[PDB]
Amino acid sequence: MQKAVVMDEQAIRRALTRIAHEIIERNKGIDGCVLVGIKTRGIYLARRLAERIEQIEGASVPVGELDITLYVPFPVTERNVILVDDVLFTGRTVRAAMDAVMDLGRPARIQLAVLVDRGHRELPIRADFVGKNVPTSRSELIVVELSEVDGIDQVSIHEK
Amino acid sequence: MQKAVVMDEQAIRRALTRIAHEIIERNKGIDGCVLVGIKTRGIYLARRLAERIEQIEGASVPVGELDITLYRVPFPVTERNVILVDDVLFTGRTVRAAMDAVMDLGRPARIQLAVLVDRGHRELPIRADFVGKNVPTSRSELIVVELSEVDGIDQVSIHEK
Ligand SMILES: [Mg+2]
Ligand SMILES: [Mg+2]
Structure with missing residues (x-):
């Protein structure tokens, strides 16, 4: 149940731009x-x-996907690899992403950009770029919707 | 060579006690x-x-040892809070490997990280939960940590190696 909307299309747009x-x-x-x-x-x-960055520096940036979820390629070695995720929670998914990335190469460094950080980390991992910090109880959940797949850009807090 | 002393014995003791x-x-x-x-x-x-913690809470705390070295002890882990301890947080690469090791021994309820000094320049999205002192450094400088158990003196200093 959508307990509350914390980010509308407008907030999302300006967060990603920043x-x-x-x-x-x-x-x-x-x-x-x-x-x-x-x-x-x-x-x-x-x-x-990637698109925003392209229209600011004139040069485009490589984009990779990489699949995880409690387990085509892209440049990795000596590159500055920026992981991008919608919600930072326990940080366990990000840890898996790092190992995955470390097996594909020796990057100069790995950074982390997330749309929302809901706290409650269970590993010593922090995002380098946070769209919005959204406090939450352990019992609450975060739902992120984007136009490309959900028909709308929106972030909300849903109770259990 | 030693450029400057950033932490003396008393500072180190006050940082750890806190x-x-x-x-x-x-x-x-x-x-x-x-x-x-x-x-x-x-x-x-x-x-x-651990010694400080027990004297404070009157409860003993398990201490483990991890030999994690990259190129150029028993007990619990599962459902426990594993608090990694290191003298210096730099690129963060050592801690990442250390977390791999911990995960090979079980699934902790969580992992935390405590370090005497953070000298910046991380190359991974890893940050310490508890930090003794933030010490700014250039990529040309180096941190040298001396603890009395091994160097006969407690002291943190920046070097231009
Ligand atoms: Mg996600
Ligand atoms: Mg060390």
Whole structure:
């Protein structure tokens, strides 16, 4: 049950735009960077970020998918690999993504961009770019919807 | 060579004593928690923490040892809070491998990380839950940690190696 909407299409749009500028900024350009989306919605976010970045620096950035969910390629070695996910929670999915990435190559470094951080981490992993911090109880859940797959851009808190 | 002393013995003691209190606080006591040191100095730090924690809560805390080295102990893990302890957080690559090791021994309820110093320049989305001191450094500088159990003195210093 949709207990509440915390981000509308507008907030999402402006969050991803800022994030696009932060990525370019913290890497002093996009040279050697690659956006790898985790899971369904993570991939769509990575693409939007890629598109935004392209229309700011004039140069485009490679995008990869990589599948996880409690377990085509893309440049990895000596590249700045930016994992992109919709929701940061326990951090366990991200840990798996890192190992996966580490087996495909030796990246200069791995960064983490997420649309929302709902707290409750169970590993010492933090996102380098956060769209919005959304406090939540352990009993609540986060639902992220994007136009490409859900017919709408929206983030909400759903009770159990 | 040693450029400057960023932490002296008293600072190190005050940093560790506080971390001990921070650990108890965030976990509301140390039950179900385990201290796992990484390499030599990490182990000595983890031991100091456990000694401090027990005198505070009157409850003993399990200390483990992990030998994690990258190129260029028993007990519980499953359903426990494994608190990794290291002297310096840098690229974060060592902690990531250390987490792999922990996962090979079981599934902890969670993993935390405590370090004496964070010198920035991470190359992985890994951050410490408890930090002794944030020490800014250039990529040309180096951190040198000396603990009395191995170097006869407690001291943190920046070097231009
Ligand atoms: Mg996801
Ligand atoms: Mg160490």
